[PDB]
Design a binder for this molecule. Structure first.
Ligand SMILES: CCCCCCCCCCCCCCCCCC(=O)OC[C@H](COP(=O)([O-])OCC(O)COP(=O)([O-])OC[C@@H](COC(=O)CCCCCCCCCCCCCCCCC)OC(=O)CCCCCCCCCCCCCCCCC)OC(=O)CCCCCCCCCCCCCCCCC
Ligand SMILES: CCCCCCCCCCCCCCCC(=O)OC[C@H]1O[C@H](O[C@@H]2[C@H](O)[C@@H](O)[C@H](O)[C@@H](O[C@H]3O[C@H](CO)[C@@H](O)[C@H](O)[C@@H]3O)[C@@H]2OP(=O)(O)OC[C@@H](COC(=O)CCCCCCCC[C@H](C)CCCCCCCC)OC(=O)CCCCCCCCCCCCCCC)[C@@H](O)[C@@H](O)[C@@H]1O
Ligand SMILES: CCCCCCCCCCCCCCCC(=O)OC[C@H]1O[C@H](O[C@@H]2[C@H](O)[C@@H](O)[C@H](O)[C@@H](O[C@H]3O[C@H](CO)[C@@H](O)[C@H](O)[C@@H]3O)[C@@H]2OP(=O)(O)OC[C@@H](COC(=O)CCCCCCCC[C@H](C)CCCCCCCC)OC(=O)CCCCCCCCCCCCCCC)[C@@H](O)[C@@H](O)[C@@H]1O
Ligand SMILES: CC(C)=CCC/C(C)=C/CC/C(C)=C/CC/C(C)=C/CC/C(C)=C/CC/C(C)=C/CC/C(C)=C/CC/C(C)=C/CC/C(C)=C/CC1=C(C)C(=O)c2ccccc2C1=O
Ligand SMILES: CC(C)=CCC/C(C)=C/CC/C(C)=C/CC/C(C)=C/CC/C(C)=C\CC/C(C)=C/CC/C(C)=C/CC/C(C)=C/CC/C(C)=C/CC1=C(C)C(=O)c2ccccc2C1=O
Ligand SMILES: CCCCCCCCCCCCCCCC(=O)O[C@H](COC(=O)CCCCCCC[C@@H](C)CCCCCCCCC)COP(=O)(O)O[C@H]1[C@H](O)[C@H](O)[C@@H](O)[C@@H](O)[C@@H]1O
Ligand code: HEC
Ligand code: HEC
Ligand SMILES: CCCCCCCCCCCCCCCC(=O)O
Ligand SMILES: CCCCCCCCCCCCCCCC(=O)O
Lengths: 25, 51, 149, 223
């Protein structure tokens, strides 16, 4: 019984952007 | 007394209190929270985790 | 079973920070960029060094390396880029080496961990290597001490 | 020293060209490239006797060294001269550093070993089995320099531990735990291989129950 939420994809993807960091913890 | 609710929201999260099983240490407590991938230095205290 | 045609010691690649590439007849080994970093990006205009070793598979003729281009800036080749018949062509001086060098002038920011395409042509091939940024024997950079919290 | 480089290439031409080629580019499906591996990789792979290999399987196992200490240095220098790479630590005399690599803080080394090393091996570093055919070998015969070079170079299936991921002080502390735990005698008697419940149960069934049953037949009667 394959898991429905686990399917491979062929999408290339994009490089993640630089994290900024929100103030006021 | 032994019975406890598994899904009681007790963990603070950016989108309201959530259950323990749905969260972890990487779950942001507020929007835009910075969580560093710190390594264990192997020594007790004196900055056990560093950037 | 583990000693058949599909082995786990014959398919094993090199345990370094370089890329193995085949430019038709010249084999590129340990292809990596040396670039000290201080901030998240290496700003354009910073001079970096591209290091690799070219091996001539054929032992009859010679070859010469020309026109190294990439979408990170301009690459300048200085020295005799001619590889001998059955010898090597070591460009640059990696750490631990007790003179052909590749100089790259950045036009866009780069950072460690990403892959940047490079084009290598000698006389009969145009191949892409996707050269990464590799740190050599440099020690770990100091980290500022965190406060009490 | 030009003599050292020439001697190393002279050993390479007769021992390693079959799987690595003449110019260290590596023979496809027979052996990888040795460019950039460094002297540390060659030193470990030859001192442990792992190289030269003889056949393709899951792992090439350890065996008696094929070259002496002088020849390992020549072989390492020749490979180091091609592509550079990490180098084996050395003492003041220029020999391979053995005693100076022992750390003074074993408690930190034990935690580091448990976090990073005791996964494939066990706590006492007895070894373990990998995915398919592969296995982590015992650490009781490796000298501190061999452990240091193994951490630097990352043999066949072992995550490479750089000098930045693991500083030399941390590496020196790690080998201190490895070297200490090998020669500490067991405190409760025979160590039983230091593997845990698996030898304990086997020893139980073959000693305690054999004696208990054998005593019972002596006291009891047959038929
Ligand atoms: C690294 C792992 C090592 C593994 C072993 C370690 C564990 C140690 C446990 C040892 C067991 C100790 C129990 C014996 C206590 C003393 C017995 C005694 O007084 O002897 C008289 C006794 C006769 O008295 P009985 O019970 O009235 O005899 C009834 C019949 O006449 C008998 O007639 P039968 O024909 O029916 O019985 C014949 C049978 C009788 O022998 C036995 O029953 C002994 C075997 C019991 C093991 C049961 C495990 C079952 C697993 C399957 O003998 C044999 O078949 C010969 C077996 C080998 C005996 C000598 C070699 C032992 C050295 C081991 C090393 O003879 C024996 O049973 C011989 C004793 C064997 C051990 C000798 C002492 C050495 C102990 C080791 C110390 C360290
Ligand atoms: C008379 C009694 C019994 C008779 C038997 C005697 C003769 C049998 C002959 C069998 C042939 C043996 C060849 C040996 C050499 C060999 O092995 O070389 C093949 C290669 O194969 C694998 O590469 C595949 C490709 O070639 C690659 O191109 C590809 O990449 C790769 O793909 C993997 O890798 C990729 C990454 O690269 C992944 O992407 C991908 O997903 C995947 O993982 C491929 O692998 P894979 O499909 O796994 O197939 C592996 C092997 C598989 O070997 C085997 O026979 C395994 C052993 C099977 C034997 C059966 C056991 C017998 C039962 C008991 C003894 C019973 C006891 C009796 C009871 C008591 C008596 C009372 C009666 O297939 C074959 O050989 C063909 C199968 C045909 C065999 C037929 C026998 C079946 C049993 C029938 C019984 C009938 C009885 C009825 C009676 C009435 C790799 O290993 C290679 O290195 C290897 O080189
Ligand atoms: C009535 C019955 C009730 C009583 C019964 C109880 C009896 C118990 C018997 C034993 C008692 C001993 C007490 C003293 C303990 C002691 O002070 O000991 C010191 C040290 O000694 C060992 O250090 C070795 C080296 O000295 C180190 O230098 C070396 O480093 C180290 O190597 C490890 O560490 C390395 C990294 O450091 C790794 O690289 C490496 O791999 C490994 O891990 C070594 O250890 P290791 O190889 O473990 O054993 C080596 C053993 C060799 O084996 C053995 O004794 C095996 C035999 C006993 C073991 C228990 C039984 C197990 C059963 C089997 C598994 C059966 C399985 C079969 C399957 C069949 C069925 C399945 C289908 O040699 C010896 O000791 C020689 C001594 C010989 C003693 C013989 C006994 C005498 C009996 C005489 C009786 C006379 C009575 C007559 C009266 C009339 C280690 O223990 C150390 O921890 C330990 O500290
Ligand atoms: C006899 C029996 C088990 C009957 C049950 C019938 C029944 C109602 C079945 C239905 C239930 C089901 C499905 C059961 C399946 C079995 C199962 C999973 C059982 C769970 C717990 C259970 C009931 C276990 C029974 C175990 C049992 C009866 C063992 C008998 C072994 C005996 C009689 C040994 C004495 C002989 C002797 C001195 C031999 C020499 C010593 C040696 C070599 C023993 C073998 C040996 C053993 C037995 C180990 O356990 C062991 C564990 C770890 C390391 C090594 C060993 C090892 O070498
Ligand atoms: C379910 C499962 C895991 C099984 C698959 C693995 C498997 C096939 C098991 C057998 C492994 C073997 C024996 C492989 C080697 C090749 C071989 C000779 C096997 C077959 C040969 C054959 C058919 C016949 C030859 C004659 C014959 C039948 C006798 C074999 C004699 C032997 C040595 C059998 C024992 C095999 C076996 C699986 C037992 C292991 C015993 C255990 C669990 C002990 C664990 C253990 C360890 C690990 C210690 O380090 C230790 C250190 C200090 C003291 C004690 C111990 C100790 O007991
Ligand atoms: C009309 C409702 C009751 C039905 C009527 C019939 C009663 C039958 C048994 C029920 C009695 C148990 C009373 C439970 C109490 C209650 O009302 O709590 C609520 C608990 O959720 C629920 O409504 C779910 C109902 C009970 C489900 C029980 C779960 C099933 C079994 C499997 C549990 C395992 C027990 C072991 C036996 C199994 C082994 C078999 C071999 C909310 O939880 P919470 O309030 O967050 O937790 C507080 C703590 O913080 C505080 O320390 C303190 O512990 C409490 O105050 C606790 O409540
Ligand atoms: C074919 C039987 C070989 C011979 C001859 C030699 N080596 Fe080798 N080597 C071989 C394989 C299949 C591998 C990869 C997996 C493995 O079994 O190790 C290697 C690898 C190395 C390495 C490490 C490479 C890395 O990236 O860490 C080194 C340092 C090395 N080989 C050196 C070496 C030396 C000195 C040899 C002559 C004694 C030699 N190799 C011969 C297969 C084969
Ligand atoms: C699983 C990925 C492992 C981790 C985690 C660690 N090691 Fe390892 N080790 C592993 C393998 C597969 C091998 C042999 C590779 C081969 O080509 O044979 C090794 C080998 C060693 C050795 C050599 C011991 C000897 O030859 O006598 C040493 C000293 C060693 N490893 C040390 C070591 C340390 C210190 C680790 C934590 C940083 C560690 N290993 C983790 C597999 C794995
Ligand atoms: C008792 C044996 C039952 C076997 C059921 C096998 C189901 C496989 C499902 C997958 O997914
Ligand atoms: C009956 C035994 C037949 C063995 C055939 C396969 C030989 C290579 C096995 C290993 O690998």
């Amino acid at each position: 019984c394959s898991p429905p939420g686990e399917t491979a994809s062929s999408e290339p993807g994009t490089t993640p952007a630089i994290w900024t960091g929100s103030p006021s913890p | 007394g032994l019975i406890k609710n598994p899904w009681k929201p007790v963990v603070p999260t950016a989108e309201g209190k959530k259950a323990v099983l749905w969260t972890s240490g990487w779950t942001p407590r507020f929007k835009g929270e910075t969580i560093y991938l710190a390594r264990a230095t192997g020594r007790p205290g004196e900055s056990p985790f560093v950037k | 079973c583990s000693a058949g045609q599909i082995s786990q010691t014959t398919t094993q690649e090199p345990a370094v920070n370089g890329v193995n590439a085949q430019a038709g007849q010249v084999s590129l080994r340990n292809v990596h960029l040396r670039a000290p970093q201080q901030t998240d990006y290496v700003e354009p205009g910073t001079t970096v060094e591209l290091l690799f070793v070219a091996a001539n598979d054929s032992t009859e003729g010679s070859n010469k390396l020309k026109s190294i281009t990439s979408d990170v800036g301009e690459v300048t080749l200085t020295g005799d880029s001619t590889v001998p018949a059955d010898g090597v062509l070591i460009v640059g001086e990696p750490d631990g080496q007790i003179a052909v060098t590749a100089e790259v002038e950045l036009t866009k920011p780069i950072t460690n961990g990403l892959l940047y395409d490079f084009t290598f042509t000698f006389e009969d091939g145009e191949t892409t290597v996707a050269v990464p940024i590799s740190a050599g024997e440099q020690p770990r950079r100091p980290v500022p001490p965190a406060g009490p919290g | 020293q030009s003599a050292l480089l020439r001697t190393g290439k002279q050993l390479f031409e007769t021992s390693c060209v079959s799987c690595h080629g003449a110019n260290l580019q590596g023979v496809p499906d027979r052996g990888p490239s040795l460019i950039g591996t460094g002297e540390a990789a060659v030193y470990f792979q030859v001192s442990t006797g792992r190289m030269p290999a003889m056949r393709g399987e899951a792992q090439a196992p350890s065996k008696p060294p094929h070259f002496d200490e002088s020849q390992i240095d020549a072989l390492g220098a020749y490979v180091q001269a091609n592509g550079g790479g990490p180098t084996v630590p050395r003492d003041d005399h220029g020999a391979v550093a053995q005693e100076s690599l022992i750390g003074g803080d074993v408690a930190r080394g034990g935690d580091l070993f448990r976090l990073n090393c005791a996964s494939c091996h066990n706590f006492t570093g007895k070894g373990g089995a990998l995915s398919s055919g592969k296995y982590a070998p015992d650490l009781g015969d490796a000298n501190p320099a061999q452990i240091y070079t193994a951490m630097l170079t990352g043999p066949q299936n072992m995550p490479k531990f750089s000098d930045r991921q693991l500083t030399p002080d941390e590496k020196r502390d790690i080998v201190a735990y490895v070297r200490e735990s090998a020669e500490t005698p067991s405190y409760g008697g025979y160590g039983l291989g230091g593997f845990g419940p698996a030898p304990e149960g086997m020893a139980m069934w073959i000693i305690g129950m054999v004696a208990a049953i054998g005593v019972a037949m002596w006291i009891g009667s047959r038929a």
